[PDB]
Amino acid sequence: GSSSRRNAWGNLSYADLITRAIESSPDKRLTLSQIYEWMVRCVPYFKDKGDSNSSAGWKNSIRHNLSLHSRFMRVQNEGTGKSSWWIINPDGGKSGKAPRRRA
């Protein structure tokens, strides 16, 4: 039957795993590369996928999960680089591309 309770370590979904890494980060915004490593640090799933091609594999799927609802939001660099950071949307938090000060 359906799993009402799940192991919050191994039975995590892809979105959860991204979150796991992102929450274990400094500013909650990380590139997919740094999410990947931050994940491998604590994740059970991407340990295996860390060694295998499933890294540059399930990472492709992970981005689809970053398109779920509005559960995640994507942040760009303020200028110190031209790369994107990725976060789970808590409210806005990092204010990435969010016009707070319109004046």
UniProtKB/Swiss-Prot annotation:
Ubiquitous. The modification Phosphothreonine is found at residue 31. Changing residue 31 to A: Decreased phosphorylation by AMPK and impaired ability to transactivate a reporter gene. The modification N6-acetyllysine is found at residue 94. It is found in: Cytoplasm, Cytosol; Nucleus; Mitochondrion matrix; Mitochondrion outer membrane. The modification Phosphoserine is found at residues 61, 67. Residues 9-103 bind DNA. Disulfide bonds: none annotated. Changing residue 94 to R: Reduces acetylation, increases interaction with SKP2 and inhibits FOXO3 ubiquitination and degradation. This phosphorylated form then interacts with 14-3-3 proteins and is retained in the cytoplasm. Survival factor withdrawal induces dephosphorylation and promotes translocation to the nucleus where the dephosphorylated protein induces transcription of target genes and triggers apoptosis. Deacetylation by SIRT1 or SIRT2 stimulates interaction of FOXO3 with SKP2 and facilitates SCF(SKP2)-mediated FOXO3 ubiquitination and proteasomal degradation. Deacetylation by SIRT2 stimulates FOXO3-mediated transcriptional activity in response to oxidative stress. Deacetylated by SIRT3. Deacetylation by SIRT3 stimulates FOXO3-mediated mtDNA transcriptional activity in response to metabolic stress. The modification N6-methyllysine is found at residue 82. Upon metabolic stress, forms a complex composed of FOXO3, SIRT3 and mitochondrial RNA polymerase POLRMT; the complex is recruited to mtDNA in a SIRT3-dependent manner. Also forms a complex composed of FOXO3, SIRT3, TFAM and POLRMT. Interacts with SIRT2; the interaction occurs independently of SIRT2 deacetylase activity. Interacts with YWHAB/14-3-3-beta and YWHAZ/14-3-3-zeta, which are required for cytosolic sequestration. Upon oxidative stress, interacts with STK4/MST1, which disrupts interaction with YWHAB/14-3-3-beta and leads to nuclear translocation. Interacts with PIM1. It is linked to A chromosomal aberration involving FOXO3 is found in secondary acute leukemias. Translocation t(6;11)(q21;q23) with KMT2A/MLL1. Transcriptional activator that recognizes and binds to the DNA sequence 5'-[AG]TAAA[TC]A-3' and regulates different processes, such as apoptosis and autophagy. Acts as a positive regulator of autophagy in skeletal muscle: in starved cells, enters the nucleus following dephosphorylation and binds the promoters of autophagy genes, such as GABARAP1L, MAP1LC3B and ATG12, thereby activating their expression, resulting in proteolysis of skeletal muscle proteins. Triggers apoptosis in the absence of survival factors, including neuronal cell death upon oxidative stress. This is Forkhead box protein O3. It comes from Homo sapiens (Human).
